[PDB]
PDB file of N, CA and C in Angstrom:
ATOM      1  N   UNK A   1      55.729  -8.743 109.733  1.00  0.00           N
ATOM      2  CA  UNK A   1      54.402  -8.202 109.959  1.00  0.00           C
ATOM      3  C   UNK A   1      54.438  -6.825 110.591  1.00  0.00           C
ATOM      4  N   UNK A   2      54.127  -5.775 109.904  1.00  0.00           N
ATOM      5  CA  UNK A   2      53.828  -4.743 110.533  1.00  0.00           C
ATOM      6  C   UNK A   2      52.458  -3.920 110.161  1.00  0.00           C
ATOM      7  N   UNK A   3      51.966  -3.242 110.979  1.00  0.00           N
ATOM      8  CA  UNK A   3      50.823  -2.624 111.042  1.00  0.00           C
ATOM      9  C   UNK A   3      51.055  -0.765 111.152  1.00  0.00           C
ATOM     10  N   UNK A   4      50.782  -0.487 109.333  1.00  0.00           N
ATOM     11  CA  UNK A   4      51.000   0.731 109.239  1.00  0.00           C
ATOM     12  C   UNK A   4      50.160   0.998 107.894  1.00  0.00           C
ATOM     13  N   UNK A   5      50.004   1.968 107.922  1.00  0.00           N
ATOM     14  CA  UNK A   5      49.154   2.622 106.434  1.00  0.00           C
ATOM     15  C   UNK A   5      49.898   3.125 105.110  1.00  0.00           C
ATOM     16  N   UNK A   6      50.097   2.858 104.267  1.00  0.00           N
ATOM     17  CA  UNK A   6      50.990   2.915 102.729  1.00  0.00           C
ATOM     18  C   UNK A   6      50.234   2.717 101.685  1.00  0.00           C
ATOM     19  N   UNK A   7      50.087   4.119 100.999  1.00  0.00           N
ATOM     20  CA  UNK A   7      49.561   3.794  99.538  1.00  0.00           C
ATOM     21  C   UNK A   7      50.164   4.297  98.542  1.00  0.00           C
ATOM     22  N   UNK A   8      50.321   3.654  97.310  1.00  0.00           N
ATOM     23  CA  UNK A   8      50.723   4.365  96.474  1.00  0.00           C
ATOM     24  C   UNK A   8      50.369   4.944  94.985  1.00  0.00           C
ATOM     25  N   UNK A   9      50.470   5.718  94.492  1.00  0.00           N
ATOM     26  CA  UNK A   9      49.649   6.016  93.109  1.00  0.00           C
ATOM     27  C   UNK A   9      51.145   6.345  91.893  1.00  0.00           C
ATOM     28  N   UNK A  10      50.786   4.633  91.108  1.00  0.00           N
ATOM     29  CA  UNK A  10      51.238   5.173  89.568  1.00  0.00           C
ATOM     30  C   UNK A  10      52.581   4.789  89.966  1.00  0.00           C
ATOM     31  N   UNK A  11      53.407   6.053  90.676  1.00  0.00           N
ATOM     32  CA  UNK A  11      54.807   6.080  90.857  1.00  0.00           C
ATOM     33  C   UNK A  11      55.425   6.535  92.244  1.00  0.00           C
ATOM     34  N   UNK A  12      54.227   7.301  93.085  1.00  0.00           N
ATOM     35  CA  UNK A  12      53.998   8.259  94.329  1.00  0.00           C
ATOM     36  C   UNK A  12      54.153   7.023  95.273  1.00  0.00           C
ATOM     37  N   UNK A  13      54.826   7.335  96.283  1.00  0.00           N
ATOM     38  CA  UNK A  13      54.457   6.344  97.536  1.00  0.00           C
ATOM     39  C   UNK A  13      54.139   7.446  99.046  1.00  0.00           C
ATOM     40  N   UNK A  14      52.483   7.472  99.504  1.00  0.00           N
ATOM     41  CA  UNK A  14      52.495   8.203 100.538  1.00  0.00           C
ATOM     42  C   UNK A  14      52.066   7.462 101.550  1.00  0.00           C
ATOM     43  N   UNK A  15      51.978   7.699 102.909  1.00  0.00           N
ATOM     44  CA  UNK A  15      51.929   7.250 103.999  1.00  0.00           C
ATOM     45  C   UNK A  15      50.825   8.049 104.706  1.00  0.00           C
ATOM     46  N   UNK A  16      49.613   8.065 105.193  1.00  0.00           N
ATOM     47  CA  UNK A  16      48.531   8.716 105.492  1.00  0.00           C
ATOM     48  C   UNK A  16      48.680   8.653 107.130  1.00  0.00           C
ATOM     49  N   UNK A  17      49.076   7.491 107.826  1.00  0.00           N
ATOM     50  CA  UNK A  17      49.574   7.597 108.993  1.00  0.00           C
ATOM     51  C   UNK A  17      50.328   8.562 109.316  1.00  0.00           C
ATOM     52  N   UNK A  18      51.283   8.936 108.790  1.00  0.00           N
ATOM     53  CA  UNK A  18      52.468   9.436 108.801  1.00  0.00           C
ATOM     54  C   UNK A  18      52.528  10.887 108.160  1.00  0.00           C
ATOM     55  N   UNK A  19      52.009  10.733 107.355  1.00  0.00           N
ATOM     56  CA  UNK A  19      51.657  12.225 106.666  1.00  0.00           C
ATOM     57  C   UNK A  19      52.448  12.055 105.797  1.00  0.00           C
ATOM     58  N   UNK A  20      53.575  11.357 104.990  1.00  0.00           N
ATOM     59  CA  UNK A  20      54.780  11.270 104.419  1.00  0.00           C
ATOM     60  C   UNK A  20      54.283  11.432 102.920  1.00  0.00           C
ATOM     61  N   UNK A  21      55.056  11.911 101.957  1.00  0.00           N
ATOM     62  CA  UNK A  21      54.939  11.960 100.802  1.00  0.00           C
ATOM     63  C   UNK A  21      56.735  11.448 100.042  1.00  0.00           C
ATOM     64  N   UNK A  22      56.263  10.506  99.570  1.00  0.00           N
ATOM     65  CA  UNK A  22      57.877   9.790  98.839  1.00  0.00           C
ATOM     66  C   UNK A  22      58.130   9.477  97.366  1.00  0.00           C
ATOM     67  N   UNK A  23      58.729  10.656  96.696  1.00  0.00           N
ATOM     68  CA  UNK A  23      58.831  10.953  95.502  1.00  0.00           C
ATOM     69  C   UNK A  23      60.254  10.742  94.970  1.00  0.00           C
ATOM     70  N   UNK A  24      60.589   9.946  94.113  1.00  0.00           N
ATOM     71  CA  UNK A  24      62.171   9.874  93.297  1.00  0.00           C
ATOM     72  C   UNK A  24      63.116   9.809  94.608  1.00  0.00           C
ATOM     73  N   UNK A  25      62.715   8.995  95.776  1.00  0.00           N
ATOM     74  CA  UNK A  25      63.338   8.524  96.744  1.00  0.00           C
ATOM     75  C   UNK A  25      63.369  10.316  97.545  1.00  0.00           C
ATOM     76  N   UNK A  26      62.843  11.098  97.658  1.00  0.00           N
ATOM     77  CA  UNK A  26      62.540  12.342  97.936  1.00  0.00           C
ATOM     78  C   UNK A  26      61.740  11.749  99.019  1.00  0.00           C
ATOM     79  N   UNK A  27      61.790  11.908 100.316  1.00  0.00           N
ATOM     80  CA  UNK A  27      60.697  12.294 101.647  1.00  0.00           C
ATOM     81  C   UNK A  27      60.519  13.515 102.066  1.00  0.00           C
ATOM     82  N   UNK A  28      58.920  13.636 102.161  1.00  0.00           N
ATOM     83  CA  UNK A  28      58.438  15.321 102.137  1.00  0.00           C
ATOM     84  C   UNK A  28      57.157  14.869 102.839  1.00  0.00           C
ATOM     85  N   UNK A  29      57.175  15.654 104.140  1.00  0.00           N
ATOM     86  CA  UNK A  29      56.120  15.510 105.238  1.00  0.00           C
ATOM     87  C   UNK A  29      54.985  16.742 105.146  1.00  0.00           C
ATOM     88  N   UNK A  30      54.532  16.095 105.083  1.00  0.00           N
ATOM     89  CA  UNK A  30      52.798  17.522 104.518  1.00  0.00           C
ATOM     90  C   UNK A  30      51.850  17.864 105.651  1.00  0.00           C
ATOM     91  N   UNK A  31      51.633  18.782 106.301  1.00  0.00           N
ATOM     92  CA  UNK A  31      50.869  18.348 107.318  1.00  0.00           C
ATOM     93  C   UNK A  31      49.484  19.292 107.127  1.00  0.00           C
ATOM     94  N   UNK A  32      49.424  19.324 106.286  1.00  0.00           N
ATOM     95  CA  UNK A  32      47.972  20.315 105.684  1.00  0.00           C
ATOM     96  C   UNK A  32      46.713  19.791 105.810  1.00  0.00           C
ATOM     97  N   UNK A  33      45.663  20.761 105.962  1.00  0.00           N
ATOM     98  CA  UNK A  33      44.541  20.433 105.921  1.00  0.00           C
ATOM     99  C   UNK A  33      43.690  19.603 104.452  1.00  0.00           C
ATOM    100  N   UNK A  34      43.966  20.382 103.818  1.00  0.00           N
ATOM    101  CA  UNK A  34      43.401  19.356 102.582  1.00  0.00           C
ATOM    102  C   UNK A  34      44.514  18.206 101.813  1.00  0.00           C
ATOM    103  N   UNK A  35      45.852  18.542 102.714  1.00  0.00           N
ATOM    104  CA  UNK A  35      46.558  16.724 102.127  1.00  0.00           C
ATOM    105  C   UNK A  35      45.423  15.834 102.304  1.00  0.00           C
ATOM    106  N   UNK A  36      44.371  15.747 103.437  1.00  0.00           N
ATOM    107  CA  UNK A  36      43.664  14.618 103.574  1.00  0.00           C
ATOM    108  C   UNK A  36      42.835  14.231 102.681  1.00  0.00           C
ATOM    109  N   UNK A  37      41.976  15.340 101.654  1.00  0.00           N
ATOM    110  CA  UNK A  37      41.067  15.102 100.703  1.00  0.00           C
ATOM    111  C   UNK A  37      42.432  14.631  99.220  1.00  0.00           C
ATOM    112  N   UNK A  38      43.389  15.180  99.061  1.00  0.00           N
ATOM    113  CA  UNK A  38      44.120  14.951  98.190  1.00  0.00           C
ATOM    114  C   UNK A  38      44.877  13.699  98.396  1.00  0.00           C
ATOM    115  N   UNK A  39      45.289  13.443  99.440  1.00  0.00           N
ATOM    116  CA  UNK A  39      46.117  11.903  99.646  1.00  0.00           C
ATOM    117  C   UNK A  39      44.942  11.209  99.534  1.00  0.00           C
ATOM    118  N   UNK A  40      44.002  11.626  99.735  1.00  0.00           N
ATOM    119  CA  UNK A  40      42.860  10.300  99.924  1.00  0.00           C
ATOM    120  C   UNK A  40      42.625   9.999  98.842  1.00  0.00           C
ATOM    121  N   UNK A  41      42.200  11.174  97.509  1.00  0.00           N
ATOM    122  CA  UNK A  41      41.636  11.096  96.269  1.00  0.00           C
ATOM    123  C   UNK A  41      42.991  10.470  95.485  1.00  0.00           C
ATOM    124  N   UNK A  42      44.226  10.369  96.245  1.00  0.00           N
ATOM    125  CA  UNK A  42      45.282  10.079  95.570  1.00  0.00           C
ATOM    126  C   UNK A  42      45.280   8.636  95.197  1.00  0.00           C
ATOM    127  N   UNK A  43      45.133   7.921  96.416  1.00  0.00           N
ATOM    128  CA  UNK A  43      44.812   7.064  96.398  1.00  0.00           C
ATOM    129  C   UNK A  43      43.408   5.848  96.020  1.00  0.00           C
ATOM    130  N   UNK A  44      42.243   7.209  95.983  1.00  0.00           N
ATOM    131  CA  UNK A  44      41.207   6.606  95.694  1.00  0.00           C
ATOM    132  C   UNK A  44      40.611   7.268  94.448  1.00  0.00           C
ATOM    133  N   UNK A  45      41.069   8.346  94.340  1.00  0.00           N
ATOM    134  CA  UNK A  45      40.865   8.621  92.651  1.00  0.00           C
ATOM    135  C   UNK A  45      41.485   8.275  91.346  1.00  0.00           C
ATOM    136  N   UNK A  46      42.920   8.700  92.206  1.00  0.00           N
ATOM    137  CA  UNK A  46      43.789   8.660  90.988  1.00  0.00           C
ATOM    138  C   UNK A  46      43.656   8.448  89.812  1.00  0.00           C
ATOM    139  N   UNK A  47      43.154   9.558  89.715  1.00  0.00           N
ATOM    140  CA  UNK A  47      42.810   9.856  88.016  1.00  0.00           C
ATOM    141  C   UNK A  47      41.769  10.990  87.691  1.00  0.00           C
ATOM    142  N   UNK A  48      41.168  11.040  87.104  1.00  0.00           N
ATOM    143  CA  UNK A  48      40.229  11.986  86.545  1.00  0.00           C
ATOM    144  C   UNK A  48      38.972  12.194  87.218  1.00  0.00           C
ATOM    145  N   UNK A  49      39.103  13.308  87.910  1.00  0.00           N
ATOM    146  CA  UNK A  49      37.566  13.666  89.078  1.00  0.00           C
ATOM    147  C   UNK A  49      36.991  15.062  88.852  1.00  0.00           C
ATOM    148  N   UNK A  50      35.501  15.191  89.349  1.00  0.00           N
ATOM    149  CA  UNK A  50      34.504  16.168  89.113  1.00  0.00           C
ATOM    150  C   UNK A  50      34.486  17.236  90.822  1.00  0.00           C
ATOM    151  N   UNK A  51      34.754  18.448  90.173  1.00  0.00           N
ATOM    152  CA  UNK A  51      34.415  19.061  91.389  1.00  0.00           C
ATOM    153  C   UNK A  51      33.645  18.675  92.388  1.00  0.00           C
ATOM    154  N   UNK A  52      32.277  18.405  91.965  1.00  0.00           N
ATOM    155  CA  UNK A  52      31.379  18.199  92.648  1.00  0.00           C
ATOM    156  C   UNK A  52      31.557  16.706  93.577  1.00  0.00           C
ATOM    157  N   UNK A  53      31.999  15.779  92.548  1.00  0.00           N
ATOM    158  CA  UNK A  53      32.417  14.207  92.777  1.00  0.00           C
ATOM    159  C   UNK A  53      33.297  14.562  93.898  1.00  0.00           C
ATOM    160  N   UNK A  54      34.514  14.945  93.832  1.00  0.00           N
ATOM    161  CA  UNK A  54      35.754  15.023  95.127  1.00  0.00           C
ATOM    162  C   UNK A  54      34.695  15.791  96.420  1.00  0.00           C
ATOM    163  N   UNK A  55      34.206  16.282  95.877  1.00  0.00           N
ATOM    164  CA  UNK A  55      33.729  17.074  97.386  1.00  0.00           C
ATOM    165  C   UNK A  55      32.595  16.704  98.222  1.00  0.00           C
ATOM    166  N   UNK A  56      31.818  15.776  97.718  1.00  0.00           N
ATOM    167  CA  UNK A  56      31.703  14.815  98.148  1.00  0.00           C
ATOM    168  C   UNK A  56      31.944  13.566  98.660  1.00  0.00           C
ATOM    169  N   UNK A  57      32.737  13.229  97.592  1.00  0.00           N
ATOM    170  CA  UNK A  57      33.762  12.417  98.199  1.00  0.00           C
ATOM    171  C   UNK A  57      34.747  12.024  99.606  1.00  0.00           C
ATOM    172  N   UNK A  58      35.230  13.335  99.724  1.00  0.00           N
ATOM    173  CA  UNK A  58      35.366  13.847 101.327  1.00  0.00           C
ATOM    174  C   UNK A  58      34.921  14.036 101.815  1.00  0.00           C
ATOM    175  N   UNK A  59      34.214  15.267 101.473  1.00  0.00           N
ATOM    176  CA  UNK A  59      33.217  15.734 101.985  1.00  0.00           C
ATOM    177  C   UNK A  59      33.277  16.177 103.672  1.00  0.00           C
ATOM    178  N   UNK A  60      34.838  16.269 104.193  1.00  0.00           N
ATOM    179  CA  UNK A  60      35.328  16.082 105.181  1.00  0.00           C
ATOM    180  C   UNK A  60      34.962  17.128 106.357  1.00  0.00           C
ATOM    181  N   UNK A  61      34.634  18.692 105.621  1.00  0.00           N
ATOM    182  CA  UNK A  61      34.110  19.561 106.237  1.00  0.00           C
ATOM    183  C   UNK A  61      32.815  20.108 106.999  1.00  0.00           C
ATOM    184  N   UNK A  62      32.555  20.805 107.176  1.00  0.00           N
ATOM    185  CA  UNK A  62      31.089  21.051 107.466  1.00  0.00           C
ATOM    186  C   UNK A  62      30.322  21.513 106.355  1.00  0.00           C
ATOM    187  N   UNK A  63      28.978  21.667 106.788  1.00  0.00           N
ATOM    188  CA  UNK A  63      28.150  22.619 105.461  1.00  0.00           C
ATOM    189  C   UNK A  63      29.128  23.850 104.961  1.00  0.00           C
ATOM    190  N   UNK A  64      30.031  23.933 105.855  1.00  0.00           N
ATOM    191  CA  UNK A  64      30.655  25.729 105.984  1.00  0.00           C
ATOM    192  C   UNK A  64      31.932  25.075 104.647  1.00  0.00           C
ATOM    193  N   UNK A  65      31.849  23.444 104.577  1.00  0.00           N
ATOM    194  CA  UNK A  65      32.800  23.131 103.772  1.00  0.00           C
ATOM    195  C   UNK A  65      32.594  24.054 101.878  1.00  0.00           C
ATOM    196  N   UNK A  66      32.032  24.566 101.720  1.00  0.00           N
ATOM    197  CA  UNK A  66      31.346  24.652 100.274  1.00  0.00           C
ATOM    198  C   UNK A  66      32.631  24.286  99.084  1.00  0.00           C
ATOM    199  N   UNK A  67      31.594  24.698  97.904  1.00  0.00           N
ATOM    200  CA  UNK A  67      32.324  24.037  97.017  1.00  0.00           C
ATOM    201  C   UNK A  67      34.199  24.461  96.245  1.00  0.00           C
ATOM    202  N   UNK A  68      34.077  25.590  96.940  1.00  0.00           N
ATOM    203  CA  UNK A  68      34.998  26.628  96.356  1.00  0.00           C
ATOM    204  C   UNK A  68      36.291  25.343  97.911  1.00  0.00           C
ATOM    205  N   UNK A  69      36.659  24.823  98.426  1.00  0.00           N
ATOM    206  CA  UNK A  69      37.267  23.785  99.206  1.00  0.00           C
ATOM    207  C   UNK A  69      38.043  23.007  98.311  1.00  0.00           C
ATOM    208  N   UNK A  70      37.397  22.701  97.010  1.00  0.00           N
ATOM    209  CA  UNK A  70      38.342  22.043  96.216  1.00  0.00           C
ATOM    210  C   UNK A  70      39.387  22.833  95.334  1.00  0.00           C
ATOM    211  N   UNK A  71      38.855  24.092  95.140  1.00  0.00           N
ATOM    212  CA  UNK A  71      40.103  24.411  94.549  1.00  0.00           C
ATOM    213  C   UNK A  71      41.057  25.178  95.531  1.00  0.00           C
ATOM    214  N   UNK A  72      40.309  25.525  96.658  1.00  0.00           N
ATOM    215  CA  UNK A  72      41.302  26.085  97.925  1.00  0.00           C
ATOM    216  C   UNK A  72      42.365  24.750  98.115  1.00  0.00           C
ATOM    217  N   UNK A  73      41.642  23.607  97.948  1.00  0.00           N
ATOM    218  CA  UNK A  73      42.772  22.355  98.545  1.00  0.00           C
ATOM    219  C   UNK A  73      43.292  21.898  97.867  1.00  0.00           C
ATOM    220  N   UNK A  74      43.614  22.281  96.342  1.00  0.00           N
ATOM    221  CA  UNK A  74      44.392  21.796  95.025  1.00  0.00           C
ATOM    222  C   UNK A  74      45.202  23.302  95.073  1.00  0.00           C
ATOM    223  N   UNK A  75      44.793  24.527  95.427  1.00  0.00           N
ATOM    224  CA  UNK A  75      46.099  25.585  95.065  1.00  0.00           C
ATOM    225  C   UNK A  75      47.194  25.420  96.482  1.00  0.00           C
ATOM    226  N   UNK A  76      46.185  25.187  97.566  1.00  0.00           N
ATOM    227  CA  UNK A  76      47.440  25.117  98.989  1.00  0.00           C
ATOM    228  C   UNK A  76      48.090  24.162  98.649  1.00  0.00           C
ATOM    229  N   UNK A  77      48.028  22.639  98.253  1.00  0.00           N
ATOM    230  CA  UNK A  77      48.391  21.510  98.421  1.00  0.00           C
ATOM    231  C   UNK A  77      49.593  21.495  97.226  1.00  0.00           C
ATOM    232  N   UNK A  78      49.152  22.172  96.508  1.00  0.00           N
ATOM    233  CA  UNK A  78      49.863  22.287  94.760  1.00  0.00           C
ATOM    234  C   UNK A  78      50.912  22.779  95.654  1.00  0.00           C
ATOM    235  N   UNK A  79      51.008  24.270  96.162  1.00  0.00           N
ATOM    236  CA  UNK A  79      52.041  25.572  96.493  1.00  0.00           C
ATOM    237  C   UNK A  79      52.601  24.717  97.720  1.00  0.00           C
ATOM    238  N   UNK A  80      52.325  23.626  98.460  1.00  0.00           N
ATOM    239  CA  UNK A  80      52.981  23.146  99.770  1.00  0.00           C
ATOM    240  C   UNK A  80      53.458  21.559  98.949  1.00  0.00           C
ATOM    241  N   UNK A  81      53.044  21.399  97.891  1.00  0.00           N
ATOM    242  CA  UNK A  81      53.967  19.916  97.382  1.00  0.00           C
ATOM    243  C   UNK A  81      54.096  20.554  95.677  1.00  0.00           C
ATOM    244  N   UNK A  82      53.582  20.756  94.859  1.00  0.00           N
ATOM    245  CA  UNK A  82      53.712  21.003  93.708  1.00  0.00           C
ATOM    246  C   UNK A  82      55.056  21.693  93.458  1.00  0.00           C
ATOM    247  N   UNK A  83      54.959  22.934  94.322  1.00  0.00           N
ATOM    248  CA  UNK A  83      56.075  23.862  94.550  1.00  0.00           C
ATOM    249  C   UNK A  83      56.871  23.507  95.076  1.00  0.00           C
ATOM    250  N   UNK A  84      57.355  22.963  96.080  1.00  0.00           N
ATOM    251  CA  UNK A  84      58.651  22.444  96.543  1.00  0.00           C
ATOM    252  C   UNK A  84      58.896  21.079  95.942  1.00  0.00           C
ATOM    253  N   UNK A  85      58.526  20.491  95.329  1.00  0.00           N
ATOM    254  CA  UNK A  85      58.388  19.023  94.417  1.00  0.00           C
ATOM    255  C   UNK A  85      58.251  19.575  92.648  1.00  0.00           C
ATOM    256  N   UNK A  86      58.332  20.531  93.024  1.00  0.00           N
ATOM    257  CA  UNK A  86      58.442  21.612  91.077  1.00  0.00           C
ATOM    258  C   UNK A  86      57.621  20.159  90.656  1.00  0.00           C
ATOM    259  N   UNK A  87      56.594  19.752  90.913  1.00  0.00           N
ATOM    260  CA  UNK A  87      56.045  18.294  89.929  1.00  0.00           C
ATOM    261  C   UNK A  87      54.687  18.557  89.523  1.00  0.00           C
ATOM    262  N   UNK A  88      53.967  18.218  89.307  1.00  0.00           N
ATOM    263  CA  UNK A  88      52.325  18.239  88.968  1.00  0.00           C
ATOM    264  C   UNK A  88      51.581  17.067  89.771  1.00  0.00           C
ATOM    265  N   UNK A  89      50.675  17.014  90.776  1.00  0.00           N
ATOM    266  CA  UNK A  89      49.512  16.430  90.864  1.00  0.00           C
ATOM    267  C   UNK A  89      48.106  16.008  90.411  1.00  0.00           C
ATOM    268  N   UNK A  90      47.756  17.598  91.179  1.00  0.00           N
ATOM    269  CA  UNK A  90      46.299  17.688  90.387  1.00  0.00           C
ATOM    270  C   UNK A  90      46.323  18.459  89.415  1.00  0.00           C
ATOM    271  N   UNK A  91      45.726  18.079  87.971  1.00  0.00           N
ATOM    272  CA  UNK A  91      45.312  19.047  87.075  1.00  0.00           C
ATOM    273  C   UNK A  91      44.208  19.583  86.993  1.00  0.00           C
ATOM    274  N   UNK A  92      43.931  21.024  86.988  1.00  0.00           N
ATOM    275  CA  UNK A  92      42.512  21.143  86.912  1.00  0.00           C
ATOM    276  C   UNK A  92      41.973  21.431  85.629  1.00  0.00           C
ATOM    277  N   UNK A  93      40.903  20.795  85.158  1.00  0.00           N
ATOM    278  CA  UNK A  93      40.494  20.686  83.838  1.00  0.00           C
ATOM    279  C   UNK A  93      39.111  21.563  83.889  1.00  0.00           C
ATOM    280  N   UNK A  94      38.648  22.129  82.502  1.00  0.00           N
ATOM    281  CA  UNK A  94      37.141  22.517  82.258  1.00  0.00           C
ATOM    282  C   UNK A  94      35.864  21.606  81.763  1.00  0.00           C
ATOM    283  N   UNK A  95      36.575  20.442  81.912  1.00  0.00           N
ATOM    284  CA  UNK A  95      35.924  18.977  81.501  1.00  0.00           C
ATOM    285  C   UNK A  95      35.168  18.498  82.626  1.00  0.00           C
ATOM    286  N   UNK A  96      35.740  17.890  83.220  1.00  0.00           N
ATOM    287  CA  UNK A  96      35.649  17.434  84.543  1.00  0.00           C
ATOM    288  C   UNK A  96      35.790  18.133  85.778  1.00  0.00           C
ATOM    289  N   UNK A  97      36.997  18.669  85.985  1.00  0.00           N
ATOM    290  CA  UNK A  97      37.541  19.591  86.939  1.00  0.00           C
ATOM    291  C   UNK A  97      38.832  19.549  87.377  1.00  0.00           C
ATOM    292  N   UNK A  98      38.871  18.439  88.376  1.00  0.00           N
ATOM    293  CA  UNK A  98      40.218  18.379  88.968  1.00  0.00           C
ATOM    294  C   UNK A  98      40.604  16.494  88.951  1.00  0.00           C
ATOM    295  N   UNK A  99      41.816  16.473  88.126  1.00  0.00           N
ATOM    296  CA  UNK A  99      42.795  15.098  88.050  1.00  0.00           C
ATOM    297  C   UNK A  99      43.862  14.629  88.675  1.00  0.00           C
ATOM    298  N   UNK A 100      43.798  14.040  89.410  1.00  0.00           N
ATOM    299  CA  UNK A 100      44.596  13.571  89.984  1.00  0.00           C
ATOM    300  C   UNK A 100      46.060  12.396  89.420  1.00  0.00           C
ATOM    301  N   UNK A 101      46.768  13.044  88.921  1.00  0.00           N
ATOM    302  CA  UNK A 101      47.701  11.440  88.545  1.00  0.00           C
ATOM    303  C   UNK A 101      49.144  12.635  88.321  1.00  0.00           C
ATOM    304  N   UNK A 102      49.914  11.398  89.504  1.00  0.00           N
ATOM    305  CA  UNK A 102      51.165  11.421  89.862  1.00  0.00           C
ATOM    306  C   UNK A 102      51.936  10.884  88.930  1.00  0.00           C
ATOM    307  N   UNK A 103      52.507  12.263  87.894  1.00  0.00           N
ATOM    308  CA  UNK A 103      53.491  11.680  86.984  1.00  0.00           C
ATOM    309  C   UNK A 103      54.686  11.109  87.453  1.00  0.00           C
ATOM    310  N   UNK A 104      56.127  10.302  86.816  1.00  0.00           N
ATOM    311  CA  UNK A 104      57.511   9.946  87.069  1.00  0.00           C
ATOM    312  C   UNK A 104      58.460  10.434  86.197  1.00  0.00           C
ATOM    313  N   UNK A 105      58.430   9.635  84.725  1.00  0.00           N
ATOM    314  CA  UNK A 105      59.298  10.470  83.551  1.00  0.00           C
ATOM    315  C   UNK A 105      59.133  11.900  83.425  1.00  0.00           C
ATOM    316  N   UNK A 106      58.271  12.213  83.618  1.00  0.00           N
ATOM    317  CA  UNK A 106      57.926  13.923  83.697  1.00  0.00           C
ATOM    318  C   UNK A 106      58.295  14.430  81.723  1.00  0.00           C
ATOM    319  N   UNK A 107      57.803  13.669  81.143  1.00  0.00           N
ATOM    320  CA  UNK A 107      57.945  13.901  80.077  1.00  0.00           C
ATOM    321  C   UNK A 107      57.256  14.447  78.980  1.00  0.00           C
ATOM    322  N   UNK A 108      57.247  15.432  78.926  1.00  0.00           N
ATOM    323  CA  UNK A 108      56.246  16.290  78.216  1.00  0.00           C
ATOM    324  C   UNK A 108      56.696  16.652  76.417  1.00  0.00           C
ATOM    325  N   UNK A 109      55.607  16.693  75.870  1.00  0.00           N
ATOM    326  CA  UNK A 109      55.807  17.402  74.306  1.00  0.00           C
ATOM    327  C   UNK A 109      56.456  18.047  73.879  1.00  0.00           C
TER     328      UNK A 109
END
C-alpha cells in the first residue's frame, strides 16, 4: 500500500506528485509551469482537444490567463520535453487545435 499519484497515457508513465516524466524507461523531471495543464490533459485528454476546450479545462490561470496560454504551454513544454525526448506530444492541428497522444513505436510513413 502506498499513497502516491501515477498516471499514465497509451505508453507515457508520469507522476504529477513528483513532477516525473517516464519514457522508454527514460526519467525526466519537468518542473514547468504549463507541465500542469499538459500532464493533466495528458492524462485527462489524451487525445484530441480544442483550444478553447483545454483552456478551460485548466483554466488554471487568471483572466490575465488568455487564450494565446495554450500554445505558449504546448511550445515551452514541447522545447523542455519534446526537445530533449526528440518525441512528439502535443500535435497542434487546424481542426481542432491541440492533441495530445503519447506515441511508443514512433513509427511513421
Amino acid at each position: 500500500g502506498s499513497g502516491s499519484n501515477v498516471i499514465e497515457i497509451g505508453d507515457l508513465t508520469i507522476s504529477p506528485d513528483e513532477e516525473k516524466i517516464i519514457y522508454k524507461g527514460r526519467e525526466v523531471e519537468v518542473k514547468g509551469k504549463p507541465f500542469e495543464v499538459l500532464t493533466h490533459l495528458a492524462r485527462h485528454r489524451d487525445q484530441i482537444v480544442s483550444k478553447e476546450q483545454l483552456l478551460d479545462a485548466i483554466w488554471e490561470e487568471p483572466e490575465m490567463v488568455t487564450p494565446n496560454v495554450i500554445e505558449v504551454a504546448i511550445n515551452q513544454i514541447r522545447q523542455k520535453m519534446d526537445k530533449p525526448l526528440g518525441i512528439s506530444t502535443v500535435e497542434t492541428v487546424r481542426r481542432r487545435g491541440y492533441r495530445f497522444c503519447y506515441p511508443k513505436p514512433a513509427c511513421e510513413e
